[PDB]
Design a protein around this ligand. Structure first.
Ligand SMILES: CC(C)(COP(=O)(O)OP(=O)(O)OC[C@H]1O[C@@H](n2cnc3c(N)ncnc32)[C@H](O)[C@@H]1OP(=O)(O)O)[C@@H](O)C(=O)NCCC(=O)NCCS
Ligand SMILES: Nc1ncnc2c1ncn2[C@@H]1O[C@H](COP(=O)(O)OP(=O)(O)O)[C@@H](O)[C@H]1O
Ligand SMILES: Nc1ncnc2c1ncn2[C@@H]1O[C@H](COP(=O)(O)OP(=O)(O)O)[C@@H](O)[C@H]1O
Ligand SMILES: [K+]
Ligand SMILES: [K+]
Ligand SMILES: [K+]
Ligand SMILES: [Zn+2]
Ligand SMILES: [Zn+2]
Lengths: 422, 433
C-alpha cells in the first residue's frame, strides 16, 4: 500500500522528467535570492544552463560555511513578508530555513508518505518524543501525523514517567524517538513495573543518531516492535527526507522532492556508482528558500537494484556518520560507528558507551548488560577480545573499560559518543 | 468603529438577536453530539435531558455542571463523543502522574476552529500576515505552543516557534528575524526587557510592536509597565486547555475588557456557593459550554475562574460580550510561570520520601520581577541519613517535583517543628496580586 502510488512507483523515465521540470523551476526561483543571484551571475548560470539532470554539475556546491556567511536570509528567494510562514533552526551560529505554506504542506505530505509506507494509519495513536519549538522533529512529525490522521500525542522531549503514562493510558501504537531515548523508555517501563514487550506499541520511528542495524534489533526485541530508520536534516525540511520501507534495507529517498548526488570529497566529482561519498542534495519542491547542491557532510552510498516493495525511488545506506564526527588519534582517522559495529556484537555489553580522547590515548567505556551472569575471568577475556577487534578495525589499540550499567551519562538530545579532552 | 477591521466581520459585529439563534442552533447540536459520550449519555439519562429539553438558551440550566472531579473520574476518554480512532487527531493532556490528568481530544474540525479563533484574536489586535510572530510559550502538551503556532500560520505571519526560555536566544531571534509580534507570559515579557539592556540593546528600540500576554493574572499597571519597557502595545489573552487553549477571550485595541467569542462559547457567570446566575455585572464563577467542538464537547464546565461581564457597548463595534480580568479562583489551584499547579501534586510526590516529615509549605514570591516557587518541607527524625545523602534526596525531590508539576521549584529541607501549623496545607502567595 502506497500513500501516493502514482509517485512512489513512478517509472524511472517519468521520475527523470519530473526531476528536470522541478530542477529548472528551483533554479529560476533560487535566482531571486541575493546568494544564488550572485553565484549564478559569476558562474554563467542562466535559464538555458539546465537542459539535462547532469547539467546541475555546472552549478557550484552550497556549503554550511556559505550559509553561515549569508545568515540569516541571504538564500531567501521568495517574498518572506507576504508568503513566509515559518522559521526553523538546525556550537556556532545556527542556520535558519524559511518556509512558505506550500513548503510546509510539501514537508507534511512527505512525513505522511513515510509513516504510511511503514504501515502507520489514521487508526494509530502516534506519540512524538522529539523536542518541539525550533527543532524540525517536533512540528515535522506533528503536521505529518495529523495529515495522515493519527491520534497524535505531542509529548515532546523527556519526562520518561509521563511518556510511559501516555503510552499506557492513550494506548500509543506508533512512537517517534531517537534510538538512545527508545532504550531509556524500555528501561523506565521495567523500573515502573511494566513489561516493555507487553505494551500497545507496534511501530517505532528512529532517527537523528547514527546507529547500527543490531542497535535497532536490540530496540525491536526490548519493546517487541518494528523499528524504522528515519533520515532528515533542517536544511532539507527536517524529517520525511529518506525512510526505510517495510523491507528494512536502505532508506528510500523521495526523488520527486530531492535530487541526490554522491560526490567524492576530494575531487568534487560523482563517485563510481554504489561507492561511499558525501551526500549532496538539491530541493525540488521548496519555494521560499530552495537549496542547490548542498554539501551535507553526511557520508553514505546508493544501494543498487530495485527494492521488493515496488518503489522506484533510490535507497541510501545507513549513514556512516557526519564529517565532524570523525576524530584523529596517532594520525589515524576513526568514526564512532566503527567502535559501535564491534561493541553491538557482544551480548554481555549494554547499549551505552563513551569514547574519551586524552593527552594521545583513546578510552572506550562501555556499560555492562543486566542479563550478564558472567564472572571476572570470563568478562576480562571478553574485554581482551574487544581491545583486539577494535585494534583490527580502527587500526589503533584503545583502552577498554567495562563500566556499571547506568554509570555513563544520558544526553538530553543526540547522545555524545566522543569526549575530546586534548 | 468605521476604521476598525475584522477577521470575520459578519460574526464579530453580528446582532445580539442573530447571535442568540446561532448559539441556540450550536447548543442543540453540541448536546446531540455529547449524548454519544459515555459521560453525557449517563448525565442526560439521570436528569431526563432529551433532544427536546433545549428550546431556549436558558434551558441549558436544566443540565448539571461538569466539574474537573467528573472529568478525572472519567479519565481518559469518558467524555469523548466522536469517533476517536477515525477522526481523532490530537490529545492535550494536563500535567502529572500522581493523579488522573485532564485530556482534551480534538478532531481536524476542532483544530481548524481553534486555529481560526486564534487568527481572529491576533487580527483583532492589529497583527497581519506581514508580521513576524514569535511564540515564547512552551510547546508539546501546552496548548499555548501549538495553539498560537496554528493560529499565527492561519493568519499568515512569519512564525518563530522559539518555545519557552533561553532569553539570550529569544533576544537573538527578535534582533535577527525582526520580530514584530511576541507571545509571552507578563513576567517573562519583563525578563526579556531586562535581558535586552544586559546585552546592551535598548528594549524600546527593537522591531517589536505588539505583545500578547496571558496564562496568569496580571494587573493593568503590570501591562503598562511592559508597554513602557519595550515601547509596545500589550494585549490580554485568555484561555484554558478545556476550551482548546488560546483564542477563548481577548482584548480589542480599546484595551478594556476581553471579548469572549460567543459563536464558539456559551458564557455563564454563576455564584460559587448557590450555582445560580449572578446579578448582571457582578463577580462570579465562569461556567462555559463549547459550541463548535465535535470530538469532545464540554457542557457547563465549572472553570473555577472568577470574573464579571463588563457592561455597555464597545467602541470597536464588536457585539461579543467582554469579561473583566481574572483575578483569582474559587478552587485551591495556583499559577506560577504561567503553569497550573494543584498543591496535592506536590504533597503526593513528598509523601513518597520517608526521610521527610508531613509538614510542608509552598511559598510563591517575586524576585527581580520573576516568580519563584519555594517548597519547604520538615525533616523526619526517623532518617539516619548524613548531609551528603540528604542533599542527594533534596536533588531527587526537585527532579520528581519538576517532572510532575512541569516547573522547577526551590526545595529547602527545614528543621522539624520550624514551619507553623493551623489545620489542608496552605500556599503562601507573597506576590503583588
Ligand atoms: O522553567 P523552569 O523549568 O521552572 O526552570 P527555571 O525557572 O530555572 O527557568 C528556566 C528558563 O525558563 C524561562 N521561563 C520561565 N517561565 C517561562 C515562560 N512561561 N515562558 C518562557 N520562558 C519562561 C526562564 O526565563 C529561564 O530562562 P532564562 O534564564 O534564559 O531567562
Ligand atoms: N537516520 C539517521 N541516521 C544517521 N544520522 C542521521 C539520521 N537522521 C539524521 N541524521 C544526522 O542528523 C543530521 C541532521 O541534523 P539536524 O537537522 O541539525 O537536527 P535534527 O536531529 O533536529 O533533525 C543529518 O545531517 C545527519 O548527520
Ligand atoms: N489572561 C489571563 N489572565 C488571567 N488568568 C489567565 C489568563 N489566561 C489564562 N489564565 C488562567 O489559566 C487557566 C488555564 O490554564 P491552562 O490551560 O491549564 O494552562 P496554560 O494556558 O497556561 O497552558 C485559566 O482557567 C485561568 O485561571
Ligand atoms: K485517528
Ligand atoms: K508572512
Ligand atoms: K495557566
Ligand atoms: Zn522498499
Ligand atoms: Zn472591543
Amino acid at each position: 500500500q502506497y500513500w501516493e502510488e502514482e509517485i512512489e512507483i513512478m517509472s524511472r523515465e517519468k521520475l527523470q522528467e519530473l526531476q528536470l521540470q522541478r530542477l529548472k523551476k528551483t533554479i529560476n526561483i533560487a535566482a531571486n535570492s541575493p546568494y544564488y543571484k550572485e553565484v549564478f551571475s559569476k558562474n554563467g548560470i542562466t535559464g538555458d544552463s539546465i537542459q539535462s539532470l547532469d547539467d546541475i554539475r555546472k552549478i557550484p556546491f552550497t556549503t554550511k560555511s556559505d550559509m553561515r556567511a549569508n545568515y540569516p536570509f541571504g538564500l531567501v528567494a521568495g517574498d518572506m513578508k507576504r508568503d513566509g510562514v515559518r522559521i526553523h533552526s538546525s556550537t556556532g551560529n545556527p542556520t535558519v530555513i524559511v518556509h512558505s505554506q506550500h513548503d510546509l504542506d510539501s514537508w507534511a505530505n512527505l512525513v505522511a508518505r513515510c509513516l504510511y509506507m511503514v504501515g502507520i494509519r489514521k487508526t494509530d495513536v502516534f506519540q512524538n518524543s522529539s523536542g518541539y519549538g525550533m527543532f524540525t522533529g517536533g512540528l515535522g512529525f506533528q503536521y505529518g501525523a495529523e495529515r495522515l490522521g493519527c491520534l497524535t500525542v505531542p509529548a515532546a522531549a523527556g519526562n520518561s514517567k509521563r511518556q510511559i503514562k501516555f503510552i499506557s493510558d492513550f494506548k500509543t501504537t506508533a512512537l517517534h524517538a531517537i534510538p538512545s531515548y527508545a532504550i531509556r523508555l524500555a528501561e523506565v517501563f521495567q523500573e515502573e513495573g511494566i513489561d516493555p514487550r507487553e505494551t500497545t506499541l507496534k511501530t517505532l520511528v528512529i532517527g537523528a543518531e547514527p546507529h547500527t542495524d543490531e542497535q535497532r534489533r536490540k530496540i525491536e526485541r526490548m519493546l517487541n516492535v518494528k523499528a524504522y530508520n528515519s533520515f532528515g536534516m533542517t536544511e532539507m525540511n527536517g524529517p520525511g527526507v529518506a525512510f526505510e520501507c517495510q523491507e528494512q534495507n536502505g532508506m528510500h529517498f523521495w526523488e520527486d522532492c530531492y535530487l541526490v548526488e554522491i560526490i567524492d570529497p576530494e575531487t568534487g566529482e560523482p563517485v563510481p556508482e554504489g561507492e561511499i561519498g558525501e551526500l549532496v542534495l538539491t530541493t525540488l519542491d521548496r519555494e521560499m528558500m530552495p537549496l542547490i547542491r548542498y554539501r551535507t557532510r553526511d557520508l553514505t552510498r546508493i544501494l543498487p537494484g530495485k527494492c521488493p516493495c515496488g518503489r522506484t525511488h533510490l535507497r541510501i545506506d545507513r549513514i556512516k556518520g557526519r564529517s565532524d564526527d570523525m576524530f584523529i588519534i596517532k594520525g589515524v582517522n576513526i568514526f564512532p560507528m566503527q567502535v559501535e559495529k564491534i561493541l553491538v556484537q557482544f551480548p554481555e555489553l549494554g547499549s551505552n558507551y563513551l569514547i574519551t580522547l586524552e593527552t594521545d590515548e583513546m578510552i572506550v567505556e562501555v556499560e555492562l548488560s543486566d542479563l550478564s551472569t558472567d564472572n571476572y575471568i570470563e568478562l576480562e577475556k571478553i574485554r581482551r577480545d574487544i581491545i583486539r577487534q577494535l585494534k583490527d578495525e580502527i587500526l589503533v589499540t584503545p583502552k577498554v573499560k567495562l563500566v556499571k550499567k547506568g554509570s555513563l551519562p544520558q544526553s538530553e538530545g543526540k547522545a555524545v559518543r566522543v569526549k575530546d579532552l586534548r
